[PDB]
Amino acid sequence: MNIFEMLRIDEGLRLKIYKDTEGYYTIGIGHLLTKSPSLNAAKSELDKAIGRNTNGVITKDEAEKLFNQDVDAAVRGILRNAKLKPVYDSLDAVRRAALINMVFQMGETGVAGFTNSLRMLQQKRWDEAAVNLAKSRWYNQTPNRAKRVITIFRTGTWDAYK
Ligand SMILES: [Cl-]
Ligand SMILES: [Cl-]
């Protein structure tokens, strides 16, 4: 298991524009296009991202390329954030994947906001962090996914995804 396989399981793969759990236009492997309610704005963003007049549909290859970029960006986002960086540096390789997943789903800013949880992860207080992470809108809105991610922080293994 690795970050790419992990995220492919959580987000799935769709080659036509679709709406995410929050109702925003998305494509590929969880690639958010726009928060705007307009399909046209979505199509415009898609074309600009791919570099061609798309018709709202992309190929597998294009979807993978946006996926690679997005994972790269999530990592860099963590490394550049003052609140995240120290946490990431303190974690083992499996748990690092869990943090990237959260940033990929909610953004750097969003994650950076889990102040207390972050301090507990840094302290290696796994069960306590797991409970704290659960008291969140994130958990209540996408509980199965959150449970998988939290199980990783709790156990340090990939069992949740196997
Ligand atoms: Cl992009
Ligand atoms: Cl879910």
From Swiss-Prot:
UniProt enzyme class: hydrolase
Induction profile: Expressed late in the viral replication.
UniProt EC number: 3.2.1.17
InterPro entries tied to this protein: Endolysin_T4_type, Glyco_hydro_24, Lysozyme-like_dom_sf, Lysozyme_dom_sf, Phage_lysozyme-like, T4-type_lysozyme
Catalytic activity, as annotated: Hydrolysis of (1->4)-beta-linkages between N-acetylmuramic acid and N-acetyl-D-glucosamine residues in a peptidoglycan and between N-acetyl-D-glucosamine residues in chitodextrins
Mutagenesis or variant effect for residue 11 to A/F/H/M/N: Complete loss of enzymatic activity
Biophysicochemical property: pH dependence: Optimum pH is 7.3.
A biological process from GO: cell wall macromolecule catabolic process
Residues the record marks as active site: 11 (proton donor/acceptor), 20 (proton donor/acceptor)
Chain's role: Endolysin with lysozyme activity that degrades host peptidoglycans and participates with the holin and spanin proteins in the sequential events which lead to the programmed host cell lysis releasing the mature viral particles. Once the holin has permeabilized the host cell membrane, the endolysin can reach the periplasm and break down the peptidoglycan layer.
Family: Belongs to the glycosyl hydrolase 24 family.
Record's protein name: Endolysin
